[PDB]
């Protein structure tokens, strides 16, 4: 439990340890989806003003 808490507080160690196709795919999908959601909100709000 002590080791896990120390590892949790250090994200850099996680990045070095977590390297894989599954990890990168999940991270990229999260970032792309987050950007897309912001774009949808921006477009809808822009078009609803008029």
């Amino acid at each position: 439990k002590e080791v896990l808490e120390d590892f949790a507080e250090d994200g850099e160690k996680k990045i070095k340890l977590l390297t894989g196709k599954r990890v990168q795919l999940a991270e990229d999908l999260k970032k792309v989806r987050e950007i897309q959601e912001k774009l949808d909100a921006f477009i809808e709000a822009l078009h609803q003003e008029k």
Binding site: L18, K21, L29, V32, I35, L39, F42, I43
Partner: protein
């Protein structure tokens, strides 16, 4: 409002894509100015608040600032990394904000340099403000200051070129009306980098000082009508940044500029078009053109992002159909639970 989301999208795009592969697909406003050319005054006039540090001829802008103007209940400025609100309606808070911005400029400076290439995103809210994103850049110096790094001029040029790399970026050149176009290199660089002129906009400062200097009307008319300059831009505008004092209020400068142009003999003689002057006309034209380009670009980007996300999802199904996508934190939680299970086993 809308521009707040657009500014946020640009910030996340820069973080997600370090390179300009995707950042070069959206319109942007690029501002380049010389030393003591009134670039800070013009940016302050558009923002309707003096938020940048002022110095007696010294380039206080030691780091680029991404100033965003949006719609808000009160005229306040908020940092991206800090939630401490600063009220621009009070002069005391304005002075504190200027000191905070200068402190941030010095903190971001790396070792061995004087001007850092990092850009700080600042959201300046206010009722009735134009919905657009502005970029502040250090002034171009003909002679390198002894107190600055030898590559400060090169860094400023590189930052301006990187910003201008976007084919949809709008160029906003700022110079001095008392200096001829042949004595400044910035105007030559702007013309060279935009042979078409489909997005170049030129802003001339200290027009009142130039008029008080008995400037030739032919040169002013040619600059405004795009005759002397070989490049053919969409249009040219002239604004007055006051008498040059670093303590003059924005409201007094704007009122004086309007009165000066109303009583100016050049405008009443029809030498210069009445809609080619004042900051209000320039701001409205820039905002409408920038917004229309943004609308078209964002539609294309949204479709491309949806298709790209679909490809990533399809790859996930093909490779890992019976698994669930989790972020770095969730994977850590799953890994530790498996460890505890093995301990029990």
């Amino acid at each position: 409002s809308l521009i707040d989301m657009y500014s946020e999208v640009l910030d996340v795009l820069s973080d997600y894509d370090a390179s300009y592969n995707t950042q070069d697909h959206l319109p942007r406003v690029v501002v380049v100015g010389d030393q003591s050319a009134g670039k800070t005054s013009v940016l302050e006039m558009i923002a309707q608040a003096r938020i940048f540090p002022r110095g007696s001829g010294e380039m206080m802008t030691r780091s680029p600032v991404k100033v965003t103007l949006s719609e808000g209940p009160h005229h306040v400025a908020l940092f991206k990394d800090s939630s401490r609100e600063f009220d621009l309606t009070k002069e005391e808070d304005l002075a504190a904000l200027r000191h905070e911005i200068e402190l941030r400029m010095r903190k971001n400076v790396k070792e061995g340099c004087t001007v850092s290439p990092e850009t700080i995103s600042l959201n300046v809210k206010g009722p009735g403000l134009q919905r657009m994103v502005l970029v502040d850049l250090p002034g171009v110096i003909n002679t390198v200051t002894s107190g600055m790094a030898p590559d400060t001029k090169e860094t400023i040029f590189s930052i301006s070129k990187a910003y201008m790399q976007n084919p949809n970026a709008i160029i906003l050149c700022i110079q001095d009306g008392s200096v001829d176009a042949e004595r400044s290199i910035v105007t030559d660089l702007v013309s060279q980098m935009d042979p078409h002129g489909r997005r170049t906009i030129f802003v001339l400062t200290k027009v009142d000082l130039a008029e008080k200097n008995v400037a030739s009307p032919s040169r002013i008319q040619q600059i405004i009508e795009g005759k002397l300059f070989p490049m053919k831009a969409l249009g040219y505008f002239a604004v007055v940044t006051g008498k040059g004092n670093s303590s003059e209020s924005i409201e007094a400068i704007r009122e004086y500029e309007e009165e000066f142009f109303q009583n100016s003999k050049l405008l009443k003689t029809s030498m210069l078009k009445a809609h080619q002057v004042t900051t209000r006309n320039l701001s409205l034209a820039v905002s409408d053109c920038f917004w229309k380009m943004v609308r078209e670009s964002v539609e294309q980007q949204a479709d491309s992002f949806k298709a790209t996300r679909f490809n990533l999802e399809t790859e996930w199904k093909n490779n890992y159909p019976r698994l669930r996508e989790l972020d770095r934190n969730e994977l850590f939680e799953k890994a530790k639970n498996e460890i505890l299970d093995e301990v029990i086993s």
